[PDB]
Amino acid sequence: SYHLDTTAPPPTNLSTLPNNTLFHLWRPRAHILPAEGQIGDPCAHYTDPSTGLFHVGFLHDGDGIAGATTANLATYTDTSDNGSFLIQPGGKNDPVAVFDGAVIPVGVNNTPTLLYTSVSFLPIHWSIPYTRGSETQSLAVARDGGRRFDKLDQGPVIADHPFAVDVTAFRDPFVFRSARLDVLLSLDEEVARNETAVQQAVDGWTEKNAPWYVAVSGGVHGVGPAQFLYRQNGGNASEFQYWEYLGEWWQEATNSSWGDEGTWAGRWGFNFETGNVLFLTEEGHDPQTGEVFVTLGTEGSGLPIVPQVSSIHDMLWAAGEVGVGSEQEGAKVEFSPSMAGFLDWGFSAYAAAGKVLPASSAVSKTSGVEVDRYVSFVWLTGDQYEQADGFPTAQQGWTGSLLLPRELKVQTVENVVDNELVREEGVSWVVGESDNQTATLRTLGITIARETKAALLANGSVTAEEDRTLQTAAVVPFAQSPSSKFFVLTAQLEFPASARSSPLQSGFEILASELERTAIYYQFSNESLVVDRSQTSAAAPTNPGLDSFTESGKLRLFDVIENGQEQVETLDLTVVVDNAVVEVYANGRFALSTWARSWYDNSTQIRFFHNGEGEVQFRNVSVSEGLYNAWPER
Amino acid sequence: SYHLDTTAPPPTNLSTLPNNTLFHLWRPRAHILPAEGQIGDPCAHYTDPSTGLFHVGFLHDGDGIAGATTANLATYTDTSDNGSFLIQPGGKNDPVAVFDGAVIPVGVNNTPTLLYTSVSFLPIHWSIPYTRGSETQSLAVARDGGRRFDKLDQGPVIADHPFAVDVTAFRDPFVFRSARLDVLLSLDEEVARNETAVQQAVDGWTEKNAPWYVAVSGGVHGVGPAQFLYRQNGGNASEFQYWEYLGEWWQEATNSSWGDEGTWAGRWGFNFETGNVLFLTEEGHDPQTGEVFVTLGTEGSGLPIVPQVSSIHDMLWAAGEVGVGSEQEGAKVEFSPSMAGFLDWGFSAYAAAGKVLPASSAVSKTSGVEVDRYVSFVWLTGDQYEQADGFPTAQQGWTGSLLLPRELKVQTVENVVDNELVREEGVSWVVGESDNQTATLRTLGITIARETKAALLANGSVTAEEDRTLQTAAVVPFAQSPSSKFFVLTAQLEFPASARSSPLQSGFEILASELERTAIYYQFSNESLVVDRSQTSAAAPTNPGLDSFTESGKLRLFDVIENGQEQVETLDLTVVVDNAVVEVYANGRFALSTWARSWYDNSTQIRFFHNGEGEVQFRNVSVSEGLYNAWPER
């Protein structure tokens, strides 16, 4: 017998508590997750052509894909009760399980069609032999407003991985259209080599009748991770049965990495997962004019390898160009990375599943958005990918959550001093334009979906803090801190050029009280935003299931000219705290999410933090408390 | 109710009788059939390398493959009780059914391995759209002396039919080795054009490390029937997982036929089934020196087509050569017929499944055979392929039977006058040599497996009849007729050349009494051996289920020189009557099998028959009564 008293010390072993007793303790209110149970990879999102509603999907309880719908990209509604499942295993093609899938809005019977990985054998992991027929790609059609997906009555449409290729994995199909690919696959190995003649065809490209491409993720044993590319046979937009294989359009050597030291974009690892193919512009998504971007998860491991265990799950992104399939007899087209980085630096952040959100959607119509966007949903595993040291799961009654929907586009950083900080190799940006004096950088833009950001602040209480400058080491409490763990903290930190070489650490302490605190700070030593959770939970000491290791992500603040005078680029911070789900956003190009499971009701204080190394100026600091309820119907 | 009294008239409607009351009425004793129930296509035969025993397989009750073993090819033993099943559906690869398969003696784990068509969807028929994933090819390994075949724990090894090819069917894998094919696929495009340099390579071939080939039967919608050829990837005899597609090595236009009139080899039809690839010599089988022979069933139909109904099931064979796949980009190798015919002319004869029977087998060692042979088992559907007009199946308690095992080799007809009878187009033979005076013909040789023939005669009572010459029309009873419906009738009929243009019909009446009789005679009008069953069963008139239509097969008796004198080749008849199962053999190159379901115990009289047109000399006429028990353990 035990009533949850979060004003008293936590019991020694949380796992000895009755089921569902910790259900509300760290559950978010503005995030996407099922009514209960666990949530795995998001997937199968789409805009219903009929209603204009945006459908969101995600694996649930390891027993299929569940769904929800939204008309504003702020509040959601479960497609049904009892789990809200759309499709589950037990069919002829998926007797064992239902893995990730993607949706063609107008496919079979001119309705939303799901191409998903139907599983017939387990286990499946890059570190152990692959069982033939493990993963196949099958079709299902949406029924009753999309509240359910009925499997087509036949075998998989892609019943096997590439011939005689020893794949490590062959799952997570993602569908997309591309003027570039279409053109490259219709010209001559000479008339398609000159980017000139090509562009002429691109300008005349029409999306409506363009064929669909499918990128499948995995790798090849003893060779390396890769993405297998397919497209409706013969480029026939009306062909949903046969998909011609275009080869491994994207591959890397086993455990190789972007850059000469794997500093900015982790490692390619031993296997690719959940690849999404995007075409971004400076305003949003355009399969005709956008640049090719790819988001993916990579599975890593230290040595020695522990078969069936992926010690590292990196949530990466890469940008580059696509060209003809060389002269050799391999892939018909190839993707070459020109820059890469992380979509989210969080250890537990992974398997992002996104989708183009049309300006014609009911969402964009309402918010007055005139362009097409690409919204990405990142997964935040609740138990370190099932490697947690006895997390109190039965006590919590739920596991995992998705992160806030994020808009992806091409971000530009103007007026950047063209120096070594810019010209480094194996980096997460490229020079869009320069004059040897100042340049304009190009990188992946990452922001909270505008409607979600607005809803988070809509009915919130606003409390600002006075501008401040810290030089000597200090921890200064806010003049007034929130009274709950649901708020958005925003702030700008200005650093002196002399801080680059200093051991400076400046930021904030959140979710704090006498016995608990979570520190978020910038560090120049390795140019990273850091989330120290060593003191985050008073319950973690005796409950190793609550991970407390430090989280961090790289963020370079370039030298820029703002008013004729050079200065270190301002660090623009936006930290969203929804209970235990903590998301750190910066300069519209950085994201780091993690779990901050504080125990006490009173751990809501916020404080300025500076280690006394160097100096820091805090500006436009403010806190919006309350957020909102993303699930009104529950 | 009614106690079966076969000395009294049959009841008007046989279906009103209790179950199993007709179980023994027309059941054979020397044929291969299950203890009870129905038998479908024979398949999966093989010689156990360990024991030397020959294993026989067949579909049973439409619920899998059952088996039996033999050490002498005379008597058999069920592999197990309760159906004696080896493998049945319900696996992940074959959730719906288990179709025909073939066995590689030394395969996975160096044990007998079954490659079979695993079925996931029904219906399947050339006349209706094909459901993707309907038929795949999976592996299973023999366990416990072969009394069972355990499916390998993974998906099919050939998970889909050729890419984007709208097949009518894709089943019945048959495995085989070939020096010729290996050579052709190892030389250049021009080096494999000159039979000279090609023969050198063949002479050095070695079966031990030769890769396995797999022929799958079916067709292509709107194109025609065909055989799909595959072989262990890269010619690697050690590779059982991946099979490279070599193309449609054998195809024919929809419902086309051998010859300008479909006279000698029926029609190619709308779909090919049960294709077996053989390499025959004048003494038996040799994958190194034998001429390519193929046996197959073809599904036919008159117009208008009745979807899901194959009105004609022809049991055909074809011989020819295999060359490099033309110049274009089609099948890598190609089979070109030089002659074709019927393996069995019976309406109900079909789906032959054979296998190489090594001289190293226990069967051959015992009987002292020094060469490898090819033994073929022909199916005799019990109910006109399930199109019977209400056959009393419940009353009989069993359905179908296989015909006697038959030896297939190259047969030679020597001293044949090289005239128009030999040079007709689209025929079942080819001239092996000639001097414009006499020639030697080459054709498919069909004889009863020697050990089975010997067993049929071993303990039988012999009764000869005096040589006789009938000139007027007459029906003359034998001086002494058998007293049972288990006997072997042999005879030789000599005709004068003048008989070729005559309306002559000469032969015998068997299974006769006052109220019943079955006529078997040769007819020069259309050069055919005929089995008239219009009076076969006193029960047929009120039981349409008992088919009574005339059965016939083409047999040309050439002009030959036997003693410096020309004569019409002797018609050498061997008629095996194994109860209702009747098999008519002639000149070692013809077979016609059917069901002769006489009712009365006394219908065992045999008579000479001549229609008075022309003349006929009967010689060496004899009857061996009794046959033998093929299943001593039952």
Ligand SMILES: OC[C@H]1O[C@@H](O)[C@H](O)[C@@H](O)[C@@H]1O
């Ligand atoms: O269980 C199948 C696969 O699921 C993926 O989500 C994991 O990241 C892999 O390590 C695993 O092999």
Ligand SMILES: OC[C@H]1O[C@@H](O)[C@H](O)[C@@H](O)[C@@H]1O
């Ligand atoms: O059920 C499937 C197939 O079985 C074969 O034996 C029949 O002869 C075909 O007509 C049929 O398509």
